[PDB]
Design a protein around this motif. Structure first.
Motif, mmCIF file in Angstrom:
data_model
loop_
_atom_site.group_PDB
_atom_site.id
_atom_site.type_symbol
_atom_site.label_atom_id
_atom_site.label_comp_id
_atom_site.label_asym_id
_atom_site.label_seq_id
_atom_site.Cartn_x
_atom_site.Cartn_y
_atom_site.Cartn_z
ATOM 1 N N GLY A 115 1.646 -58.670 3.917
ATOM 2 C CA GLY A 115 1.408 -57.404 3.225
ATOM 3 C C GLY A 115 2.686 -56.763 2.728
ATOM 4 N N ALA A 116 2.538 -55.810 1.812
ATOM 5 C CA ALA A 116 3.664 -55.029 1.328
ATOM 6 C C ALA A 116 3.761 -53.684 2.041
ATOM 7 C CB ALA A 116 3.583 -54.832 -0.185
ATOM 8 N N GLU A 117 4.941 -53.408 2.595
ATOM 9 C CA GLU A 117 5.245 -52.131 3.243
ATOM 10 C C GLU A 117 5.884 -51.232 2.206
ATOM 11 O OE1 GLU A 117 7.185 -52.301 7.095
ATOM 12 O OE2 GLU A 117 8.498 -50.595 6.572
ATOM 13 N N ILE A 118 5.239 -50.088 1.968
ATOM 14 C CA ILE A 118 5.534 -49.228 0.837
ATOM 15 C C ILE A 118 6.097 -47.901 1.339
ATOM 16 C CG2 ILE A 118 4.581 -48.083 -1.201
ATOM 17 C CD1 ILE A 118 4.198 -51.074 -1.375
ATOM 18 N N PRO A 119 7.330 -47.556 0.922
ATOM 19 C CA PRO A 119 7.893 -46.273 1.308
ATOM 20 C C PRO A 119 7.239 -45.110 0.566
ATOM 21 C CG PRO A 119 9.405 -47.398 -0.170
ATOM 22 C CD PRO A 119 8.219 -48.303 0.010
ATOM 23 N N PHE A 120 7.027 -44.003 1.273
ATOM 24 C CA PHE A 120 6.470 -42.805 0.656
ATOM 25 C C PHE A 120 7.373 -41.598 0.849
ATOM 26 C CE2 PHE A 120 4.303 -43.162 4.841
ATOM 27 C CZ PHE A 120 4.615 -41.936 5.407
ATOM 28 N N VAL A 121 7.242 -40.631 -0.055
ATOM 29 C CA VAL A 121 8.032 -39.397 0.032
ATOM 30 C C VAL A 121 7.659 -38.676 1.346
ATOM 31 C CG1 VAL A 121 8.708 -37.287 -1.131
ATOM 32 C CG2 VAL A 121 7.907 -39.259 -2.473
ATOM 33 N N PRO A 122 8.651 -38.339 2.187
ATOM 34 C CA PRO A 122 8.346 -37.801 3.515
ATOM 35 C C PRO A 122 7.849 -36.342 3.546
ATOM 36 C CG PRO A 122 10.702 -37.853 3.191
ATOM 37 C CD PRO A 122 10.093 -38.585 2.024
ATOM 38 N N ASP A 123 7.725 -35.712 2.383
ATOM 39 C CA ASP A 123 7.255 -34.343 2.288
ATOM 40 C C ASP A 123 6.551 -34.207 0.941
ATOM 41 O OD1 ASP A 123 6.888 -31.553 2.792
ATOM 42 O OD2 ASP A 123 8.943 -31.353 3.547
ATOM 43 N N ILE A 124 6.120 -32.999 0.606
ATOM 44 C CA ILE A 124 5.387 -32.781 -0.630
ATOM 45 C C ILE A 124 6.311 -33.100 -1.810
ATOM 46 C CG2 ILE A 124 4.103 -31.136 -2.023
ATOM 47 C CD1 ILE A 124 2.976 -31.948 0.940
ATOM 48 N N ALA A 125 5.908 -34.053 -2.655
ATOM 49 C CA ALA A 125 6.713 -34.476 -3.808
ATOM 50 C C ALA A 125 6.732 -33.412 -4.892
ATOM 51 C CB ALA A 125 6.162 -35.777 -4.389
ATOM 52 N N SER A 126 7.918 -33.121 -5.423
ATOM 53 C CA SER A 126 8.064 -32.264 -6.591
ATOM 54 C C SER A 126 7.536 -32.974 -7.825
ATOM 55 C CB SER A 126 9.537 -31.912 -6.809
ATOM 56 O OG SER A 126 10.093 -31.375 -5.625
ATOM 57 N N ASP A 127 7.054 -32.201 -8.798
ATOM 58 C CA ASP A 127 6.587 -32.746 -10.076
ATOM 59 C C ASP A 127 7.586 -33.714 -10.712
ATOM 60 O OD1 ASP A 127 4.312 -31.200 -9.849
ATOM 61 O OD2 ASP A 127 4.849 -29.795 -11.449
ATOM 62 N N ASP A 128 8.876 -33.403 -10.632
ATOM 63 C CA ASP A 128 9.864 -34.201 -11.354
ATOM 64 C C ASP A 128 10.263 -35.498 -10.644
ATOM 65 O OD1 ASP A 128 11.535 -33.241 -9.395
ATOM 66 O OD2 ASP A 128 13.045 -32.439 -10.774
ATOM 67 N N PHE A 129 9.719 -35.757 -9.455
ATOM 68 C CA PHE A 129 10.014 -37.002 -8.724
ATOM 69 C C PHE A 129 9.454 -38.240 -9.394
ATOM 70 C CE2 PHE A 129 10.663 -35.309 -4.108
ATOM 71 C CZ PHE A 129 11.752 -34.586 -4.529
ATOM 72 N N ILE A 130 8.368 -38.081 -10.141
ATOM 73 C CA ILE A 130 7.711 -39.206 -10.792
ATOM 74 C C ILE A 130 8.277 -39.392 -12.199
ATOM 75 C CG2 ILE A 130 5.684 -37.856 -11.616
ATOM 76 C CD1 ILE A 130 4.152 -40.665 -10.619
ATOM 77 N N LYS A 131 8.574 -40.638 -12.536
ATOM 78 C CA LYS A 131 9.269 -40.947 -13.775
ATOM 79 C C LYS A 131 8.329 -41.279 -14.935
ATOM 80 C CE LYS A 131 13.016 -43.796 -15.600
ATOM 81 N NZ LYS A 131 12.401 -44.043 -16.930
ATOM 82 N N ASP A 132 7.454 -42.267 -14.735
ATOM 83 C CA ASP A 132 6.712 -42.897 -15.829
ATOM 84 C C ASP A 132 5.211 -42.593 -15.834
ATOM 85 O OD1 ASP A 132 8.874 -44.257 -17.124
ATOM 86 O OD2 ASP A 132 8.921 -45.699 -15.468
ATOM 87 N N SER A 133 4.617 -42.583 -17.022
ATOM 88 C CA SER A 133 3.174 -42.385 -17.158
ATOM 89 C C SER A 133 2.427 -43.588 -16.608
ATOM 90 C CB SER A 133 2.791 -42.145 -18.624
ATOM 91 O OG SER A 133 3.386 -40.936 -19.094
#
Ligand SMILES: C[C@@H]1O[C@@H](O)[C@H](O)[C@H](O)[C@H]1O[C@H]1O[C@H](CO)[C@@H](O)[C@H](O[C@H]2O[C@H](C)[C@@H](O)C[C@H]2O)[C@@H]1O[C@H]1O[C@H](CO)[C@H](O)[C@H](O[C@@H]2O[C@@H](C)[C@H](O[C@H]3O[C@H](CO)[C@@H](O)[C@H](O[C@H]4O[C@H](C)[C@@H](O)C[C@H]4O)[C@@H]3O[C@H]3O[C@H](CO)[C@H](O)[C@H](O)[C@H]3O)[C@@H](O)[C@H]2O)[C@H]1O
Ligand SMILES: C[C@@H]1O[C@@H](O)[C@H](O)[C@H](O)[C@H]1O[C@H]1O[C@H](CO)[C@@H](O)[C@H](O[C@H]2O[C@H](C)[C@@H](O)C[C@H]2O)[C@@H]1O[C@H]1O[C@H](CO)[C@H](O)[C@H](O[C@@H]2O[C@@H](C)[C@H](O[C@H]3O[C@H](CO)[C@@H](O)[C@H](O[C@H]4O[C@H](C)[C@@H](O)C[C@H]4O)[C@@H]3O[C@H]3O[C@H](CO)[C@H](O)[C@H](O)[C@H]3O)[C@@H](O)[C@H]2O)[C@H]1O
Ligand SMILES: C[C@@H]1O[C@@H](O)[C@H](O)[C@H](O)[C@H]1O[C@H]1O[C@H](CO)[C@@H](O)[C@H](O[C@H]2O[C@H](C)[C@@H](O)C[C@H]2O)[C@@H]1O[C@H]1O[C@H](CO)[C@H](O)[C@H](O[C@@H]2O[C@@H](C)[C@H](O[C@H]3O[C@H](CO)[C@@H](O)[C@H](O[C@H]4O[C@H](C)[C@@H](O)C[C@H]4O)[C@@H]3O[C@H]3O[C@H](CO)[C@H](O)[C@H](O)[C@H]3O)[C@@H](O)[C@H]2O)[C@H]1O
Lengths: 552, 552, 552
Positions: B501-519
Motif C-alpha cells: 500500500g501507499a502511505e500518504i502524508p496529510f496536513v497535521p491541522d486545518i489546511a489553508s486555502d493556499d496550500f493546494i496548488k493545482d485544479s
C-alpha cells in the motif's frame, strides 16, 4: 702516411667535388655531403650501388618534378634534405586574418597570389569544396602541377630525417621498412607531402611517419596506398602534426588506383594532431562514396565484405583534430576499435563513421559543424557501440548533434539539446547512488523523455521546488506526467507551501472502467452532480467496484 | 694522394688542436668536435661565419655566465653539450626524505648546502613561497646568480640536441626556427633551463622544446618570451618532462619585460609532464596579478582586450602534472580550448583558470590542495564551459573543490562533497535510461539538492529501502521533501513493511486555502475536533470546496 | 700535408681494417664503423678504454650468446646495431591466420617450425599458459636458449639507438644513465629483448627505453631489475611499443633474483602501447604470487610493508593495451596514482590490481576476458578509489565485470550488467539536473537496485510510459517497489490512460498497526467484509486510529 690516413679517417664525399649527383653517389663509400645547391631535372635518377650511405644535406635540391633515389642499402639515412620547386605557382589562401575559413568562392579567388607557400594550388576537389570556384578561377590558377619531390624507389630500410622544403614532396614508391622521421615542417606542393605508395610489388610494410610536422600542400599531408602492417601493426603514423592540408592531414586511400587496390590494413594512427585541414583531419576510410566502385580489384570482393565493412584492423588511439573545414575524423570498416579521440572547434562536422560492429571509447566532439554545412556533428551508419561521448563546448537550426541510429551509446556528457540526439539505445546501467545538484534555479529536476513519444518534450519529471525563499529550509517534491503535449500537466505533490501533506490529482469526471491498471488499487474521480469524490476500486480479486471517497 | 684525400674524407676540426674556441670555429668547414674541456669567460662570443656546422660535444664547457654562439648557418646542430658552472653555490632543498614538501621557512633554511645540484639557489619568489625565509636565510644564500649558459644569439634553424650539465642553462635570444631537442636532464642554475626570448626583432616563431627532460633550477624549466607560432602553431613544448622547477615546469611569460611585451600566442603545449614544481606545473598566463600593469606596450591594449582576456589561441592538450606546491595548471585568455588535462597529488591547487568564453574538455583534478593553503582545488573566473571534470581521489576545512561561479559544467565524476561545488549551472542533459546501484547500504537513493535553498542539505529524495533482511525480495519506495531544514521530513511511501500500500502524508491541522496548488487535485488534512480526515479540494473548475475524507 | 690532414679530417676507424673487434676498439679515437659482418663468440669482451666513442653500425654482429662492451666513456653512442643468432631454433606461433589466440596445447604444438622469427622458443611459463604442452612438445622444442645479445656492462651514459636483429637481445648490466632509444623492431630471442639489470652495485638510475618497438621474444620485451628512478623519476619506459611478447610488454621484476631484490621504484611508464602479449601488457608488480617469498632480501621487509603494499611510487599515465592473452594491465603497491589507462579487445582479463590506498583515474576496460578464462575483467584487492571507469564494448557465464570489494568507485560508463559489478561503494555525488532519454522503448526508466537485497533484481523504479501511441502527447508516471522478488510488484501511477488522476495502491487486507511508518500519515486498506476502504491513521501526536475511507 697514406696507409695510416686511409685507416684513421671517416670516409665522406661531397657534392662540391662532382659535376653531377650520380658522380658523387658512385664515389661515395660511407658518407655523402650535399654542400652545394643542386639543380635537378624531373626524373633524374641516382643509383647508389646498394651501398649503405649516410647522406647529410646542408643545401637544396632545386627542381620541379621528381629526384629519384635508387639502390640504397638497408640502413641508409638521408638527413636535412630541402626540396624546392623552380616554379612559383598561383596559390589560394581560403582563410582570413582572424583565421576564419572562407567558404565563398569569390572571396577565395580574391586571395590568389604567386608564392611557393602560405596557400596551395587549386585542385579538382576545390571545385566541390568551394562551389562555383571552377568558373571564377582564372586559367593560370587551374591545372597547376608544381611539386619538388624526393622519390625513394624500391628500397628497404631507408630513413629520411628532418626533411623540409618549399612546394616540397616526399615519395616512397614500392618501399618497405622505410620511415619519414621528424619532418621539419616542409611546405607542400601539388602532391601529397609524405606518401608511401605500394601499388606494385608486395603490400607495403614497415613504413612509418614518425614525429615532425608539415604545412600546406594541395592534397593530404601524410598518405598511404596498399600498405598492410600485419598483425604486428608495423607501419602508420605516430607523433605527427599536420597543418592546413589542402585535403586531409592523414589519409588511407580508398578505391582502385591504376589496376589495383589503394587500400590499407593494420596500420597505427596514434599520438597525432591535425589542424585546419580543408577536408579531413584523419581520413581512415577504405571505400569512398566520392567515386563508388562495384568491385575491389586486388582486394576482398564485395561478396565477402560489403562496402565500408572491410576488416581494416587499424590501431587507432589518442588523436586530436581542431579547425577542420570538412570532417574532423572520418573512417569506415567492420570490427574496429577506436579510442581517445578529441575533435574540437571545427567548421565542418566532427566525425563521420561508416562503421559496423565497431567500438568507440572516450570520444569528444566539441563545437563542430560550426558553419552548419552538415547534417550532424557525429554520424555513425552501422551497429556500433559508443562508450563515453562528450558533446557541446560553448557554441549554440534543426541539425542533429549525434545521428547514430543503429548504435548503443552510454556516457554522454555536455550541454547537448536532447532533441538532437538520435541513437538506437542510450543507457547508464551502472551508476551508483545519485544526486542531482541544481544551481541558478529555484528547483532541481530529474526528467524523463521517451523519444518515440516526443523528441522535444519531457514526458514526466521528479522535481524539488523551493517553498518561499532561499534558506526557508523547506521544499516540495513533485511527480509529473505529460498530457495533451503539455509537460508537467498532471502531478502529485509532497509538502507544497510547507503543508506537510500530499496533493493528489483526481480524474476530473466519471472514470471509465479501463482507467485503472492494477488490482488492489483505487483511482479517485470527480462526481460533479453531488460535489463528491468517488473511488474506482480494483479489488484484490481484480473485480471493479465504485465507492464514495469524500463527501459534503 | 693529397687531392684524393681531400675528396674522400669527412671534414672535422677538433678543439684539442686550437687555443681558443673562436680559432676552432674559424677553421671549421663541416664538423667541429669538442674533445677537451673548455673554460670560457662570461660573454665569450664565437662567430661561426654563417657556416652550416655539425658540432659534436664530448667534453664540458666550464664557466659562470654565458658562452655566446653567433652566425651559425641554417641547419647547424649542436649535440651532447655539457655546461658547468665554476661556482658551487648555496642551495635549498624544500622537500623531505619521504618527498613531502617543506613549507616552514626555518625547516627550508636548515636544508642549506653547497652543491651544484639537488636543490636550487633562493630567489625573490622564495620570499613569498616560504614566508619569513627572507629574514632567516644567511647572506651567502641570498642574491646568488650562478648559471653556466649556452646562448644561441640571432640564429635561424639551429638545433641543440641531447644537452646536459650542472647549474646549466640554454638560451635562444632573437632566434627563429630553433629547437631544444631531447634535453638530457640538465640540472639547472639560477636562470631558466631552456629559454626562447624574442624581445627584440621579430616575434619568435618556429621555436620548440621537443622531448627530453630537465631537473631543478631556481626558476622555470622551459619558458618563452614574445613568441607567436602563427595560425600554423609553429612553436611550443611537445613531449617534455620537467622535475622540481624552482618556479614552473613550462611558462609563457606575463607582462612587460624591458620596454615591450613578453607574452606569447599560438604555441603548442602537448604530451608533456611536470612533476614537483615549487610554483606551477604549466603557467600559460599572459597577464599576471603578481605585478599588475595598466597597459601592454608592444601588445594589444587593455581597451581592446581586458586583463586576462587576450586571444592567446595556444593549442593545449594531453598534459600531466603531479606534486605541484603551487598550482598544477594555470592559465588566462579568452576563447581558449583546452583538453585532456590530468593534475594529481598536488600540495597546491590543481587549476587556476582566469579564462573567459573558454572550453575545458576532459579535465581531471585529483587530490590537489592537499596542504589547504588555497581556497579551492579548481578555480575559474569567467564564463566558461567544462565538459568532463573528475574530482577527488582518496584524500579528504571549508574550502571549495570547484569555484567556477560563471561556468556551466557537465560530467563531474568522483566522491565530491556537493557542498563544495560552486558553478553557474550543472546539468546532465543527455543521459539514457538510468540505474542507481547501491552497495554497502540497506537503501538506494536518488537525491535532489537546490543550492539556492541549501548547499549542505538535500531538499528531496527518491529512496528504495530493504524490507526486513537481505534476500527478503521486498523493498519500499519513498518520495521525500525537506521541512524545517530537516532532510526527508515529509514523505510518501509505497510498500513499507511489504504492506503493498501507499502511505500518504496529510496536513497535521486545518489546511489553508493556499496550500493546494493545482485544479482537479485534493489535499488531505487533519480535523482533530472530530477525529477525521478532511480533503481540501480544488475542483476541475478551479474553485475550492472542503469535503470529509475519512471518519470514525 | 700530414699535419694539416690530421687537423681537418674526422677520425674514424672501421672494422674492415682489423682482424678482431678489440683491435678496432683499441685503435678508435672518435668514430668506429662496423662495415663488415662480425662473428663473435659468446662472452667475447671488448674494452673501449674509457673512450667516448660514436659507434656506427652498417653490418651484423653474428653469434649465439653475449657480445660484451665494457669501458665506454660517458656520452658514447651505438647506432644501427643488428644482432643475429647462428642457431635457427624451433618456435611456436600460438595464433591463427585470423589472429585469434590458440589456447589448446595440441594446436600450439602443431605450429612448430624452425625459424629465427614469427614465433618464440617455448619456456617454462608456456607449460602453465598452455596446459598439457609440456608433455606434447617434442624434446628439440624444450629447453632451448638462443639469443644474440649486446651486453653493455658497467657503463654510464651510453645510448643504443635504432637497434634491430633476429633472435636479438640488449642487456645493460650494472649501468646508469643509459638508454635504449628508437629500437628498430628487433625480433626477440629467448631472453628479454631490452633489459636493465642492476642486481650488483648501486640501484639502477637514469635507465630508459625511449621510443621504438620490438616484436616476439620468449619473455618480456622491456624489463627492469633493481632500478630506482628517485623522486626525480629518472628512468622507465616512454613512447614504446611491444608486439607479441612471449611474456609481457613491459615488466618490473618481482621477488628475489640471486641473493637480492629485483624490484623497482620511481620509474615512469607513459605514452606506451603493448599489443598481443602472451601474458601481460604492463606488469608493474613487485611482489609475485607465482613464487611467493616470505622475506625481501635487499628491500623493505614484510614487517614494514606487507606483500603487495610496497611504496613503489611509479609515474604511470597514458597506456594502451590490446590483444593480451593474460592480463592487460597488472600491478601492485600502496599509495599509487594511475591515470589514463585503456585496455581493449583482450582474450585475458583487462586489469589485475593488487593495490591498496591507491587511486585510478580515467580507466577504460573494454571487451576483455573474451575467452572467459578469468573470474573478472578488472580486479582490485585493496581499499582503492576509481574515478572514471568505462566498461563493455560490443562483446557479451557468471563471471564478474568488476570485482573491487574494498574500493569506492564513481563514473562507470557502458552497457555493464549491474549484477556483474561488485564494489564497496558506488556513487555519483556531483551530477547536475538530470534527464533520462529513452530510445527504442515505449517507456523511460530511472531504476534503483540495492545490491545487499539482490544483485539481479531492481528494488524500485520511476517510470514514464506512453499512453496510446507515438505522438499522443500523453504518458503516465509510475513509482514502483519490489515484493516477493517480483520487480515492480506494487506501484502508484499518475495519468494512466490519460485519466489525469493518481492510482493509489492499498493494503489488500486488514493492515497491521506496524505497517504505518510516520506520524501525520494514513495507509489505505481493504475491508472485504463491508466492501470498503479503511485508513490506518497515525495521527500528528503519533497515536493510531482506524477510520472509514471509502464506502458503498
Ligand atoms: C576530396 C575527398 O575528400 C574526402 O571525401 C575523401 O575522404 C576522399 O579521399 C577525397 O577524395 C579524393 O580521393 C578519393 C580516393 O581516396 C577519390 O575517389 C576522389 O575522387 C572523386 O572526387 C573528386 C572530387 C572528383 O573530382 C573525382 C572523383 O573520382 C578524390 O580524388 C582526388 O584527389 C586525390 C588526392 O587525394 C587524387 O588527386 C585524385 O586524382 C585522380 O586519381 C589519382 C590516382 C591520379 O593520380 C596520379 O596523378 C596525380 C596528378 O594530379 C598524382 O598526384 C598521383 O600521385 C599520387 O599517387 C601515386 C600513385 C603515388 O605514386 C604518388 C602520389 O602523390 C598520380 O601520379 C601518377 O600519375 C601522374 C600522371 O598525371 C604522374 O605522372 C605521377 O608521376 C605518377 O606518380 C590522378 O591523375 C587522378 O586520376 C583526385 O581525383
Ligand atoms: C613567482 C610567480 O609564480 C607564478 O605566480 C606566476 O605565474 C609568475 O609568472 C611568477 O612570477 C614571476 O614572473 C612574473 C612575470 O611572468 C613576475 O610578474 C613576478 O614578479 C612579481 O612577483 C615577484 C615574486 C616579486 O618579487 C616582483 C613582482 O614584480 C615574478 O618575477 C620574478 O621571477 C621571474 C622569473 O620567472 C624573474 O626572475 C623576475 O625578475 C625580474 O624581472 C626580470 C625580467 C629581470 O630579468 C633579468 O635579470 C634576471 C637576473 O635575475 C635574468 O634571469 C633575466 O634573464 C631572463 O630574461 C631575459 C630577457 C632572457 O634573455 C634570459 C632569461 O633567463 C634578465 O636577465 C637579463 O638582465 C640581467 C640583469 O641582471 C642579466 O644581465 C642578463 O644577462 C640579461 O639577459 C630581473 O632582473 C627582475 O627585474 C622576478 O621578479
Ligand atoms: C609468467 C609470469 O607471468 C606473470 O604472472 C607475472 O607477472 C610474472 O612476472 C611471470 O612469472 C615469471 O617471473 C616471476 C618473477 O617476476 C617468477 O616468479 C615466475 O616464476 C614462477 O613461475 C614460473 C611459471 C615457474 O616455472 C617458476 C616460478 O618460480 C616467472 O619466472 C619465469 O620467467 C622469468 C622471465 O620473466 C625467468 O625466466 C624465470 O627464470 C628463473 O629465474 C631467473 C632469474 C633465472 O635467470 C637466469 O637464467 C635465465 C636463463 O633462462 C636468463 O634469462 C636470466 O637472464 C635475465 O636476468 C639476468 C639477471 C639479467 O642479467 C639478464 C636477463 O635476461 C638469468 O640469466 C643469468 O643466468 C643464466 C644461467 O642460466 C645465464 O648464465 C645468464 O648469462 C645470466 O645473466 C632463471 O635461470 C630461472 O631460475 C622463470 O622461472
Amino acid at each position: 702516411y697514406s696507409i695510416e690516413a686511409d685507416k684513421k679517417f671517416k670516409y665522406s664525399v661531397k657534392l662540391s667535388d662532382y659535376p653531377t649527383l650520380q658522380d658523387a653517389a658512385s664515389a661515395a663509400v660511407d658518407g655523402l655531403l650535399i654542400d652545394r645547391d643542386y639543380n635537378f631535372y624531373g626524373g633524374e635518377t641516382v643509383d647508389f650501388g646498394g651501398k649503405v650511405l649516410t647522406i647529410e644535406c646542408k643545401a637544396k635540391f632545386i627542381g620541379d618534378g621528381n629526384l629519384i633515389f635508387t639502390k640504397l642499402g638497408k640502413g641508409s639515412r638521408i638527413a636535412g634534405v630541402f626540396m624546392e620547386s623552380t616554379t612559383t605557382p598561383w596559390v589560394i589562401k581560403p582563410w582570413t586574418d582572424d583565421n576564419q575559413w572562407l567558404t565563398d568562392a569569390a572571396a577565395v579567388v580574391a586571395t590568389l597570389k604567386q608564392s611557393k607557400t602560405d596557400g596551395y594550388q587549386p585542385t579538382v576537389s576545390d571545385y566541390v569544396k568551394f562551389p562555383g570556384i571552377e568558373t571564377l578561377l582564372p586559367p593560370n590558377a587551374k591545372g597547376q602541377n608544381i611539386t619538388s619531390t624526393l622519390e625513394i624507389r624500391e628500397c628497404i630500410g631507408v630513413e629520411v630525417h628532418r626533411a623540409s622544403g618549399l612546394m616540397a614532396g616526399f615519395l616512397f614508391r614500392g618501399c618497405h621498412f622505410c620511415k619519414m622521421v621528424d619532418a621539419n615542417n616542409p611546405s607542400g606542393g601539388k602532391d601529397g607531402i609524405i606518401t608511401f605508395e605500394n601499388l606494385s610489388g608486395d603490400w607495403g610494410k614497415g613504413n612509418y611517419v614518425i614525429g615532425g610536422r608539415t604545412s600546406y600542400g594541395s592534397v593530404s599531408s601524410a598518405q598511404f596506398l596498399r600498405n598492410n602492417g600485419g598483425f604486428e601493426r608495423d607501419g602508420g603514423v605516430i607523433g605527427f602534426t599536420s597543418y592546413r592540408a589542402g585535403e586531409s592531414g592523414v589519409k588511407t586511400w580508398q578505391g582502385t588506383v591504376g589496376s589495383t587496390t589503394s587500400r590499407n590494413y593494420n596500420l597505427q594512427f596514434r599520438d597525432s594532431v591535425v589542424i585546419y585541414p580543408v577536408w579531413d583531419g584523419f581520413d581512415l576510410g577504405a571505400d569512398t562514396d566520392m567515386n563508388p566502385e562495384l568491385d575491389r580489384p586486388g582486394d576482398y570482393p564485395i561478396t565477402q565484405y560489403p562496402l565500408h565493412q572491410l576488416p581494416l584492423n587499424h590501431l587507432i588511439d589518442n588523436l586530436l583534430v581542431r579547425g577542420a573545414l570538412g570532417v574532423g575524423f572520418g573512417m569506415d570498416g567492420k570490427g574496429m576499435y577506436v579510442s581517445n579521440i578529441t575533435v574540437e572547434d571545427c567548421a565542418g562536422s566532427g566525425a563521420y563513421l561508416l562503421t559496423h560492429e565497431s567500438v568507440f571509447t572516450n570520444i569528444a566532439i566539441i563545437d563542430t559543424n560550426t558553419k552548419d554545412f552538415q547534417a550532424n556533428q557525429i554520424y555513425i551508419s552501422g551497429a556500433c557501440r559508443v562508450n563515453g561521448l562528450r558533446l557541446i563546448g560553448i557554441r549554440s537550426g534543426q541539425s542533429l548533434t549525434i545521428d547514430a541510429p543503429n548504435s548503443t551509446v552510454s556516457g554522454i556528457t555536455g550541454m547537448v539539446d536532447p532533441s538532437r540526439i538520435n541513437v538506437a539505445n542510450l543507457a547508464e546501467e551502472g551508476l551508483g547512488n545519485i544526486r542531482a545538484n541544481s544551481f541558478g534555479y529555484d528547483s532541481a529536476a530529474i526528467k524523463l523523455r521517451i523519444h518515440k513519444l516526443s523528441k522535444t518534450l519531457d514526458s514526466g519529471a521528479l522535481y524539488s521546488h523551493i517553498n518561499g525563499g532561499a534558506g526557508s529550509g523547506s521544499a516540495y517534491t513533485q511527480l509529473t506526467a505529460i498530457s495533451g503535449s503539455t509537460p508537467d500537466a498532471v502531478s502529485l505533490k509532497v509538502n507544497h507551501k510547507d503543508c506537510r501533506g500530499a496533493e493528489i490529482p483526481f480524474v476530473p469526471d466519471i472514470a471509465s472502467d479501463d482507467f485503472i491498471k492494477d488490482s488492489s488499487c483505487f483511482l479517485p474521480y470527480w462526481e460533479n452532480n453531488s460535489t463528491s469524490l468517488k473511488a474506482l476500486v480494483k479489488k484484490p480479486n481484480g473485480e471493479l467496484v465504485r465507492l464514495t471517497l469524500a463527501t459534503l
